[PDB]
Amino acid sequence: MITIDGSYGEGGGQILRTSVALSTITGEPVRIVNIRANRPNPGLRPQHLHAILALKHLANAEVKGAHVGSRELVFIPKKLEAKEISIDIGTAGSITLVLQALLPAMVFAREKVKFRITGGTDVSWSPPVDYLSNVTLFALEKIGIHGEIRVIRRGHYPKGGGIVEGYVEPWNEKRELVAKEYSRIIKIEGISHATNLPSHVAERQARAAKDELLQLKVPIEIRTEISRSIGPGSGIVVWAETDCLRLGGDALGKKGKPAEIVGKEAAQELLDQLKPGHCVDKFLGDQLIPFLAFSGGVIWVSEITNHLKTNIWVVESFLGRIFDVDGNVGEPGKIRVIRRV
RNA sequence: ACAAA
Ligand SMILES: Nc1ncnc2c1ncn2[C@@H]1O[C@H](CO)[C@@H](O)[C@H]1O
């Protein structure tokens, strides 16, 4: 079987996620060693563990080393079959990153797959769920992927208790993505939420973001959501609707962090992503990699990151040569699929 | 205050 070195490049959880997803899709067994070497708390966390267990269910796999703290995992898949997914991470572990592991596998399963996942919806160092549903899925629709991601209940660090449900359809009609430069920003949209917190938190995040985005000279409409869960939390995502794809920026609240700073951060992130004039923001750039191998096409990104380069390396470890990358890490770049599988 | 990566 193939062995993937989890200390390579970015050295994070994405190496593990992409590996197990591609093992599940291709049927090739995989061993990942040095899991999350380049992270403060190496080895599997609950998020990774439950992602692995769900893929294990879908592919009826044999798994070795699947425990919290493990730096090594062996994943030997059998047949990929559509089954209903139900996952309780048990912590504030990232639902969106669990979905990042699952999505590529679920859409290759030949029948619709429904999922329900509990954990964190809006937690550090991961996509907020509103980013995944409004930016990532929007781009995925363009290559023929159809599904739905619904937030039933928010969950924040540390208690979690968030609930997300949805489904994807089998990816039967694949279409290439061509996303180079945008020529027009049509408008800015967003969702500012606050959970178990005063409603002015959501309103102030939105107002501060709007302030920073006035310079773009386009309409701005940021919806506010007041909700309840088992603990306090807040967050905001904003995105630019362009003539091509949506680019996003986002930020999270925490105790003592002013709502205004939250909103300002998310807006400034969006502004940074727009500056180069490329269609794909730096987060989506890395998230699209496993899908582009099968869809073909070309994306120009605002910034080539180590995440993106590491994801390419994992994908090519399984599928062979796929991509040509024009540009350096930390700068805008161009990623062409020069061989579709 | 390592339930978040
Ligand atoms: N703030 C964020 N917004 C959107 N995606 C994010 C954010 N932070 C991390 N990610 C994504 O989460 C993963 C990090 O392992 C990558 O896919 C990265 O793009």
Side-chain angles (χ1 to χ4, degrees), chain A residues 76-315:
Chain A
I76 308 169
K78 303 174 196 71
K79 190 148 194 64
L80 174 55
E81 285 168 9
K83 313 188 193 183
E84 189 156 6
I85 298 303
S86 186
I87 298 164
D88 298 308
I89 298 172
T91 64
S94 173
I95 296 170
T96 58
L97 293 178
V98 166
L99 256 6
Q100 176 180 99
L102 244 30
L103 274 168
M106 290 190 305
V107 300
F108 270 97
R110 294 134 109 276
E111 299 158 273
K112 168 164 155 169
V113 177
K114 294 185 175 198
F115 53 86
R116 179 184 195 266
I117 313 176
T118 72
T121 59
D122 294 274
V123 294
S124 302
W125 312 299
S126 57
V129 60
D130 293 337
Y131 180 101
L132 180 63
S133 62
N134 293 285
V135 181
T136 306
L137 223 55
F138 180 87
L140 293 184
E141 188 282 327
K142 299 294 191 192
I143 61 182
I145 284 154
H146 303 290
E148 205 172 271
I149 295 176
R150 303 171 46 245
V151 183
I152 299 305
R153 189 164 83 190
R154 298 283 179 178
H156 298 91
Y157 165 85
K159 284 180 173 178
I163 302 164
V164 168
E165 292 173 3
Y167 70 87
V168 289
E169 313 269 26
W171 195 12
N172 285 329
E173 192 164 335
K174 310 187 179 69
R175 159 168 36 114
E176 63 177 25
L177 179 59
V178 174
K180 304 179 186 186
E181 276 173 342
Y182 66 84
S183 59
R184 181 178 171 228
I185 301 173
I186 296 163
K187 67 183 164 169
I188 305 303
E189 305 235 281
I191 303 163
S192 174
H193 74 272
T195 302
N196 290 23
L197 248 9
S199 78
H200 60 71
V201 171
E203 298 157 354
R204 283 198 282 138
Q205 290 176 166
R207 183 63 261 185
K210 187 159 172 194
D211 284 354
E212 283 320 295
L213 301 168
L214 300 175
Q215 58 182 288
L216 292 177
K217 275 60 133 45
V218 304
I220 300 161
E221 295 294 337
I222 296 169
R223 178 164 61 74
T224 53
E225 165 203 302
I226 305 307
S227 59
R228 293 285 306 177
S229 189
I230 66 177
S234 78
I236 180 173
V237 59
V238 284
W239 66 84
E241 191 98 76
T242 73
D243 58 312
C244 187
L245 296 178
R246 292 170 179 179
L247 297 84
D250 57 71
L252 246 27
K254 59 196 201 174
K255 185 50 170 168
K257 178 177 190 190
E260 286 76 21
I261 299 294
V262 181
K264 186 178 180 179
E265 282 183 4
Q268 186 68 52
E269 184 69 68
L270 174 53
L271 287 166
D272 290 347
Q273 294 308 303
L274 289 161
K275 196 183 162 194
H278 288 184
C279 290
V280 186
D281 75 46
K282 73 181 180 189
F283 305 106
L284 222 211
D286 87 57
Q287 295 174 33
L288 252 19
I289 295 302
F291 299 95
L292 287 168
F294 301 96
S295 72
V298 59
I299 55 170
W300 294 9
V301 300
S302 61
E303 183 188 332
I304 295 174
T305 61
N306 281 315
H307 270 86
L308 182 155
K309 294 191 68 61
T310 293
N311 219 12
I312 281 180
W313 170 84
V314 179
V315 168

